[PDB]
Amino acid sequence: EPSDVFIGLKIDQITGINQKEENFSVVGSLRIDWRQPLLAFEHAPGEPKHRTYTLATFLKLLEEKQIRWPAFTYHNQQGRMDFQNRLISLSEDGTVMYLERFTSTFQAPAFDFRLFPFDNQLFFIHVDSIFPQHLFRFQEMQGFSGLGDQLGEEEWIVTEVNTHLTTHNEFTKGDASRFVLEFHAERHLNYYLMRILIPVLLIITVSWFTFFLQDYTKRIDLAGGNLLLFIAFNFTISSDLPRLGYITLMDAFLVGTFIITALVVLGNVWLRRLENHGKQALARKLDIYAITSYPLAYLLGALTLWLLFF
Amino acid sequence: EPSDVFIGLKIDQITGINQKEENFSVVGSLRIDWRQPLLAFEHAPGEPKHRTYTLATFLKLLEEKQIRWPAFTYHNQQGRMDFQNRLISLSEDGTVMYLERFTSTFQAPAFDFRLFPFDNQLFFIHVDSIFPQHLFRFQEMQGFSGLGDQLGEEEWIVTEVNTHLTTHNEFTKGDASRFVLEFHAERHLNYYLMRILIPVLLIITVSWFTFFLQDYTKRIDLAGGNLLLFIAFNFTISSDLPRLGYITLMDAFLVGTFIITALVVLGNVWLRRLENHGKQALARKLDIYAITSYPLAYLLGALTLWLLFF
Amino acid sequence: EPSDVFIGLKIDQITGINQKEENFSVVGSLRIDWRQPLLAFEHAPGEPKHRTYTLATFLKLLEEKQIRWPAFTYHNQQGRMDFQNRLISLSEDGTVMYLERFTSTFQAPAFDFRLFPFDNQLFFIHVDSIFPQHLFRFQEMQGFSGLGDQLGEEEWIVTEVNTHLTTHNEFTKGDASRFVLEFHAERHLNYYLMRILIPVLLIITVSWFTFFLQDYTKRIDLAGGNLLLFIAFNFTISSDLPRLGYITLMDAFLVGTFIITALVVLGNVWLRRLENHGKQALARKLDIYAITSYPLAYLLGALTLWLLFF
Amino acid sequence: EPSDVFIGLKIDQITGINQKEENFSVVGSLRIDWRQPLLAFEHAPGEPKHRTYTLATFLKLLEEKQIRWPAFTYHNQQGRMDFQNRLISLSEDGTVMYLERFTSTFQAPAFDFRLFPFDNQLFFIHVDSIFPQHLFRFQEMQGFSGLGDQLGEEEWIVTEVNTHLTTHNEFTKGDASRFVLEFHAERHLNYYLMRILIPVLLIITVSWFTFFLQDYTKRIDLAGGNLLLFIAFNFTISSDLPRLGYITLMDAFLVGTFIITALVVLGNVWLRRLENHGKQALARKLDIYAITSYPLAYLLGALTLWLLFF
Amino acid sequence: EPSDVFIGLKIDQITGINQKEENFSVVGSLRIDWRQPLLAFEHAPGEPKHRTYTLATFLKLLEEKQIRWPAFTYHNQQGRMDFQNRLISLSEDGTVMYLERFTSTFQAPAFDFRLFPFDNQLFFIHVDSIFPQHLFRFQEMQGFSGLGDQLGEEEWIVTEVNTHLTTHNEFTKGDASRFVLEFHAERHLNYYLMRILIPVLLIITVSWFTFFLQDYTKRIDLAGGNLLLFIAFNFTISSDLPRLGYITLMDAFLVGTFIITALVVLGNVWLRRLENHGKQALARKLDIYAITSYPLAYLLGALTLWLLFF
């Protein structure tokens, strides 16, 4: 019949989440408990009941004994996995206890930036068996898997963590076991508030103050630079993310500021054209719409994206 | 006679395409099925019909048995190939089943940016046999090769994928086998629309609004900065790409905006010179050409590149 | 009974502290003294009393003799540990003397930027025993552990260093030994003085000089750009640090400059509106509040953060 | 007498040339043919006439047979050399055929930027024998060495390629063999035309158009910003290159634009000072020199560097 | 008694000096000549008098023969040392000749930027013996150590090179041998002249030309932006260097330009205030101090730092 292989995986550190590259990096420990009766050994009185091996001399021992080990792969792994510890402890019984401490980057293919920066994402690690379920069946090692207390991440905040077993058909026709460690994390909005919301709101508010000067030309020059500032901010936000084929809530907000600013230019050009054509008195009356449009326009726009996305 | 070696290659992830360096990076699995009758082994009843080996003790076994393995190379490979799994399963028969899970950057020499960002490119992986076709003939392993479901790429979108066998003469006089996994991908234009087309169009449109002010000096100062903005945008686009010896559709568009902006300065200088020489009334009549040239000039220019490239 | 394992750890160099990534990197030496009576050897007269081994042939010797070594891990390690020396010197007695020279990045999870740049941080290295205290008990090797004379760091300045032993339960039910090398460091404020305090103070002071011109429009244009400069400075500071979910003393200072500058615009708009509405004489009298507010506002704000944080 | 060792080296890819770091990187294959009569073997009928080995078990075989191999070094190598293939094929004869596929960065010490961007450089690879010419004499393997068809470089264009043998005295008193693969490459000027020549020429030309406005103050403000733009461009060019102790043709061009721009400011200050001192009519007559100096100054300057450098 | 171990170290390339990180990187060769009479071997007539080994099988041979090797460490090493060659040639005598070709980054703790860019620095490599002087005494291998002819560095220029032996107490109570290869290098000032001195001098000079316009407001606006430019230049210089706790000659120069520019604003505000208060004729007389202060102020400041630092 098939031998049960117990998989445990604990993430100790989140060394970073790279959203631009849709990957994350962690320091973690993998724990395997697999009982192979052929590995059983007799000991003379006094000598150890538990043999401890390096991985290299353990695999070599398996090859001599013609024993197949539950060869596994981190399916969503990326690049190099720098190992710290790869140790085996073998009991009289045949109970092999394996520990693998590593640092690695993993694929984050579940990334959805539609609501960025208000988004919540799913990150996971797939531990696949190369051999099919008729030889080795993966089971959940009980008191081990999950995320630590000192992960070191400052922007993301883990909302929930889960482990579950399933199947894959990567190398074989028959189903093969897959252990999954999943977690969900959401953003600490402070960065976004401090670096984007407050500067953008400041530019808008202090620019509106200048309307009380009743200089239409001065408004035009101001809305002109404001438009460039928003174009600049637009590039800075573009930097954090991949070259997505879809519109972000952030993109919508930025395109929104462009449109209002464009109309601010357009409108004040008209008011200055009235002034120029000897209808200065009229420009002055209409100016009340000009002054009160500006705040309403941005507030209307803000409710529009909020409805349009939530 | 020559032994058939079955090659399979599956790309699981596109970790990135670096167009500036004309290379791409992938996580993939290589699968080899090669029957060597000399590798055949006898087993006593009950014992394994399938011996499983690490790559190191398998090659050492070949060297003892004085057996030549189908030594292969990833011809278009770049730098380090970080391996995850290099495992061998040997049957009584001599059927060696090899699996190689790796992460690697590969050369993308097929890169043609003439129509960028509207371009479609070809990416491939060459798996060459070091030994000639009289010793080892490469065959396509049937249900394996291709690209996965979760590649993780956000800008490129795979239009088609193919596998085919051919020959090379890299190390030998005689022809040697080459397995090829090719794919074509094209861009998600959203990034370009959001970061380049809309900002450039905004600068142009809102700058045109100001013509209704009938201040020629103000137009000159505006077209002056606009020219610098386009020069800046020109550098930002230069960043994404190599220092090509050829003109991009993007380069054409940018050079086009320079020329129109240059003439906008030139023209408005003339209109302001008429005004200055007591012919203000004339500048005012001609101004209608000045106002309507601007939109037509850019629309004429836009049809010109489109014809000139498509 | 359990065997005492003596741990010594000396940091020779601080290759860098990366605050944006909340990690630090060091070149160091680990020293272990562990007496295993089973390792004892007899020598014929004249031959060595001290056998010297590479780590690889020492571990292989342990595996033959079926001896369990005090397998240890650098708990807060990050990525690769580039080794220089991994040497063993074994006495007739069984006294194994191990030396491990390495370069490594470590996690700095103790990072608190609330008072940045006036902050003091704690950095440490955890050396855990994989095996529980009933088998191996970690002890402090006496004349070795600590930090060197040539660490090479220029901004941080080590205020204090300590070593202490404790316990962890990482792999086992029972307590396992943990050796800790801690140090505290604080910043050399010069960089911050030269690049941030002096430029910001200059912008403010020379901008205030211009108030003696009695041009309200000119003040408005100046406070407008000043606001953008501070927004720029705000991004430059954002660069050095993680995307924290909390307010830095530095953030407070920057938000403070925004508010005063915003009011500088607001106020001068009012004074210019009085001038515009034929009350130029009144604007002139009030102007004395306008001139003296500016210095007081910034000095009041400076005492406010100082109280609010200290 | 000394044994002839045949060296072949083929560069398959130029992964990049880093001029700022004066190094280049390539994917290449090294081929060695060396006949050692002591390596000769007898085979029983039917068994292989050609033994194939991994490098590791081949060197171990040499050490048993007490055979010295022609130990070689890539003299101008830099950092890590990521190997793909290191394979040996040994004939009944003793003919050892070695293949080494690698990716590596090499030193480019021949770099002369005096005529940049119009420069032509020399790049090479030195393959030195550790042992002197009395033991091993390097010979050129005939149908192999050189550069490929798909190098992947876009800016450089290989003008010529050569191989030659010489001597070095690196480790020994006596001469030791050195195999050299050299190539010369020159630049595709398009990047420079598109990003530097056209933007600089545009700034100059459209700035000259404004002279027809006959506003001296406006010219001064324009030449002021133009000077800053050129200072900016100067830093952008500084980026591509090392901190050379010599003047580049590019440096000369940039310093040239500074001087003319400085005089443009200087001159127009004088013309505006005449206007200011009631000699407006005189400023107007001299203005024709002012208008025609500008184009001549830059064209005169362009012939001056061309003569001064070619 | 103790065995003499001859150390030779030749730096072939300076791959770079990173002043921001206070480290340097080199390609070099280490040469060791150590005579161990126990390593002596007998050969039958005709067979080799010199056995050649890989490092791995040489160390394994030492471990069998129970011979202690002079284990050494590059004390100031940083990260990974990418080896090219690690070869041993053993004579009948016992004369072991070791060669170690490597690429490595080393600590530069001797870095003093007080006179930057006019500074001269000391760079070195420490080769320590792990074992004390009673076992192994380090001696200088005669015709080998030093720096090469093609180092590839462009900014630094090696003023002098030295080798000397001393002692350390890193791992032991007793003194242990240390071989030292030191060199001093100074800067090629061209980069600094071209990118910093000439642009700063240009800004100052062409800004002074504008004083001949007798527009105080225009001077104020100019000195305002000039101050920002210097603040920008200040950040660009900050980039090249660490976050030092001390004042650089460069810092002094920059702070100097700030002060003069600040006073230029201050002064011209006063002159414009006289003009504003109907004392235009007085502003005009004082203006001669205003015009001649500017050049003297900067020349006075330049002699002040020169005295203050030299």
Ligand SMILES: CCCCCCCCCO[C@@H]1O[C@H](CO)[C@@H](O)[C@H](O)[C@H]1O
């Ligand atoms: C910009 C936000 C601050 C607004 C406060 C009003 C005073 C003017 C600030 O300088 C402004 O900066 C813009 C951006 O570049 C320019 O387009 C504009 O012409 C210029 O007047």
Ligand SMILES: CCCCCCCCCO[C@@H]1O[C@H](CO)[C@@H](O)[C@H](O)[C@H]1O
């Ligand atoms: C710039 C696109 C927005 C146009 C809207 C009209 C109002 C003015 C906006 O500021 C302008 O910015 C240019 C770019 O730097 C400067 O050259 C120019 O002198 C300045 O007036």
Ligand SMILES: CCCCCCCCCO[C@@H]1O[C@H](CO)[C@@H](O)[C@H](O)[C@H]1O
């Ligand atoms: C800026 C600090 C120096 C103040 C000295 C007064 C002279 C003017 C300096 O240039 C100013 O720069 C600001 C920042 O961008 C712009 O908003 C403003 O319109 C412009 O006049």
Ligand SMILES: CCCCCCCCCO[C@@H]1O[C@H](CO)[C@@H](O)[C@H](O)[C@H]1O
């Ligand atoms: C700059 C090249 C374009 C010239 C066309 C004339 C219109 C003005 C363009 O804006 C100018 O930009 C300069 C560079 O920053 C500033 O110094 C200058 O005061 C400003 O007027």
Ligand SMILES: CCCCCCCCCO[C@@H]1O[C@H](CO)[C@@H](O)[C@H](O)[C@H]1O
């Ligand atoms: C700047 C060095 C060149 C001086 C030559 C005099 C002409 C004006 C150049 O443009 C100036 O650029 C400054 C820097 O941003 C601005 O503060 C200032 O308002 C603006 O007038």
Ligand SMILES: O=C(O)CCc1ccc(Br)cc1
């Ligand atoms: O091939 C390798 O490197 C590791 C594989 C491995 C498989 C099963 C156990 Br239990 C332990 C290790």
Ligand SMILES: O=C(O)CCc1ccc(Br)cc1
């Ligand atoms: O030399 C190597 O590292 C790998 C080569 C290899 C060749 C054939 C088979 Br089947 C498996 C492996």
Ligand SMILES: O=C(O)CCc1ccc(Br)cc1
């Ligand atoms: O497994 C390893 O790489 C190193 C472990 C080790 C454990 C105890 C001593 Br004493 C020395 C070394």
Ligand SMILES: O=C(O)CCc1ccc(Br)cc1
């Ligand atoms: O020492 C090494 O790694 C490689 C050296 C080498 C020398 C001669 C032949 Br032929 C093949 C290889």
Ligand SMILES: O=C(O)CCc1ccc(Br)cc1
């Ligand atoms: O432990 C190592 O890797 C290298 C050490 C070494 C010591 C002495 C000689 Br001679 C040669 C080599």
